[PDB]
């Protein structure tokens, strides 16, 4: 299928990497597991709208944390 896995944080993507391996295990076909994704990003600060010291736009970060776990041979029972 060659599809990614963009969750929320680090543990959010960790639980989504084991949950996708469970649903893929249900189907009768080859299943993958761990997927190398070397850390790589950046950060920057500016201004918001009202008053909120430093670190503009109250958000976690601009991390592109994702995944690549999926199925190889999807059947009729691969929907669940």
């Amino acid at each position: 299928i060659r599809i990614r896995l963009k969750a929320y944080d680090h543990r959010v993507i960790d639980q989504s990497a084991e949950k996708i391996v469970e649903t893929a295990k249900r189907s009768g076909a080859d299943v993958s597991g761990p997927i190398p994704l070397p850390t790589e990003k950046s950060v920057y600060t500016i201004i918001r709208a009202v008053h909120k010291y430093k670190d503009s736009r109250e958000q976690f970060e601009q991390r592109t944390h994702k995944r690549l776990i999926d199925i190889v041979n999807p059947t009729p029972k691969t929907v669940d």
């Binding site: 599809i3 896995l5 963009k6 944080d9 543990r11 959010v12 976690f60």
Partner: peptide, 21 residues
């Protein structure tokens, strides 16, 4: 606490997605 949690406090919503995210 955002970076403080993640070992015991994960997230409330959990689902295997990236397109359906």
């Amino acid at each position: 606490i955002g970076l403080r949690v993640g070992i015991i406090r994960d997230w409330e919503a959990k689902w295997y997605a990236e397109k359906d995210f």
